[PDB]
Structure 1
Amino acid sequence: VMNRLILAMDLMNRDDALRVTGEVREYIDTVKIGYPLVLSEGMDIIAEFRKRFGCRIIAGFKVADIPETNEKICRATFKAGADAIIVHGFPGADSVRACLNVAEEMGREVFLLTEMSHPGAEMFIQGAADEIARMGVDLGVKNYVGPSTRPERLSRLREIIGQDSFLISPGVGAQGGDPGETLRFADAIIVGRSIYLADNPAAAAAGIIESI
């Protein structure tokens, strides 16, 4: 992705979301849109962003349901225009395979979330993360999400998935993660608040890029 930087656009109002995204567009080419924006403004916001900014859109939906429901969620998400969707691996292989089947049908991609970046991720997710990553490899997953806040875990995850897999990483900035250290292991970093809550989002994005 452009400058190895993905904007997590979690503002809830369409006007502010469009303003900030347009201001930092020259520094990115990929935007992660999640439920904070979609549940407030509707799924049509995905196609609007894709058209207006010509950026790739990752739907950050943390899909975590049974196979049947996961299939419906992925179908609606790709119908809305998303290029990829993030799915949790903790609910198991069948739930991930359901997402992979819809992505195959629709010519889209699935990103498998292994370990999360927040403190609570240490409680249960961390202990299952290496196995979730290996499950991904077994299922043919080529895109993964891992934590900026724990570079030693990001290193181990990179070890499991290999150098050819694409790995993106949130938790940079607000959560404590460092851009440069994270990029020693991840292909791209996801940044939300450090950019969208800044007084000057473009200057904030430019600063991150210059730091790396």
Structure 2
Amino acid sequence: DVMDVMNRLILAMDLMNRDDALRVTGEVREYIDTVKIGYPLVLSEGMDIIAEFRKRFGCRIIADFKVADIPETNEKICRATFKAGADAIIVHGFPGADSVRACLNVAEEMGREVFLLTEMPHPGAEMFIQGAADEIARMGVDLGVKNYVGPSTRPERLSRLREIIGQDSFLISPGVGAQGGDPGETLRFADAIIVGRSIYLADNPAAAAAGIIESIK
């Protein structure tokens, strides 16, 4: 089947120093079992931070690296990322099918997962990404992709995305909170929501996460 995310809540840990990242994550460890780590933290502290999170919290790690290179390089990025212990990696679909397949090849070989990013939540996404979103999602479906990332800031787009990928596919959605996305509205189509700043920048992260979950009881 597809992965099970505790409380349908994924923590986006984009703090850039190990101490704060581990500290804040520890404060909310009781509310989640899946953490999304991106380049802000990895480039600042090193790829070893991925294995550290998995061992210290027993959590699943999704590497939000928005892989967007040529096939050969994508394969290398994925291999290095999975070797570092990542359970899944987020890949852009805009570069084309060959670039996505290169990632799928490595994930299948190593027994990991690929999440296809279909559309982004920021304003700039309307320039080029929005118009290719439906076709990117269909491309994923045609290649057997089972995991997707869609924008929480555009509910009707997320809904359309779900229609394209089917009820079987696993869908997670960022842009909740700081970017304006609503937890409840987003979960009408997504299997899990991604939350970053609203939690890690709060004066009380535990309360922030607790409140979010309370909002979606």
Structure 2 length-normalised TM: 0.97
Per-residue deviation, residues 49-88 of structure 1 (Å, max 9, x unmatched): 0000000000000000000000000000000000000000
How many residues of Structure 1 are paired with residues of Structure 2 in the alignment?
212
- Aligned-pair distance for 1:11? 0.1
- Aligned-pair distance for 1:210? 0.2
CA distance in 1, matches of 2:144, 2:58: 28
Look up the SS of the partner of 1:101 in the other structure: helix
CA distance in 1, matches of 2:14, 2:193: 15
CA distance in 2, matches of 1:164, 1:100: 18
- Aligned-pair distance for 1:98? 0.0
Per-residue deviation, residues 165-195 of structure 1 (Å, max 9, x unmatched): 0000000000000000000000000000000
Aligned counterpart, 2:25: 21
- Aligned-pair distance for 1:23? 0.5
Aligned counterpart, 2:141: 137
Calculate percent identity across the aligned residue pairs: 99
CA distance in 1, matches of 2:198, 2:23: 16
The RMSD of aligned alpha carbons is 0.3
Per-residue deviation, residues 113-136 of structure 1 (Å, max 9, x unmatched): 000010100110000000000000
- Aligned-pair distance for 1:46? 0.1
- Aligned-pair distance for 1:16? 0.1
Look up the SS of the partner of 1:156 in the other structure: helix
The structure 1 segments of at least 4 consecutive aligned residues displaced by more than 4 Å after TM superposition are none
CA distance in 2, matches of 1:5, 1:79: 25
**What stretches of structure 2 of length at least 5 have no aligned partner?**
none
